[PDB]
Amino acid sequence: LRLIHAVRGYWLTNKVPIKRPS
């Protein structure tokens, strides 16, 4: 909701290799 969680979730999901096809 708030930008802090938006930007956090952004890099937090990017540092991790997304091997799952969503």
| Major β-sheet annotation | none
Global structural class: mainly alpha
Number of beta-strand segments: 0
- Binned, the helix content reads 40-55%
Q: Rounded to an integer, what's the Rg over CA atoms?
A: 10 Å
Task: State which percent range the strand residues make up.
Answer: under 5%
Cα distance spanning the termini? 21 Å
PDB class: sugar binding protein
Keywords: Polysialyltransferase Domain (PSTD) Polysialyltransferase ST8Sia IV Polysialic Acid (Polysia), sugar binding protein
Assembly: monomeric
Entry title: NMR-Based Model of the 22 Amino Acid Peptide in Polysialyltransferase Domain (PSTD) of the Polysialyltransferase ST8Sia IV
Question: Overview of this structure, please?
Answer:
It is found in: Golgi apparatus membrane; Secreted. It comes from Homo sapiens (Human). This is CMP-N-acetylneuraminate-poly-alpha-2,8-sialyltransferase. Belongs to the glycosyltransferase 29 family. CMP-N-acetyl-beta-neuraminate binds at residue 22. With 22 residues, the protein is mainly α. 45% of the residues lie in helices and 0% in strands. The protein has one helix at 3-12. The protein is elongated, with a radius of gyration of 10 Å.
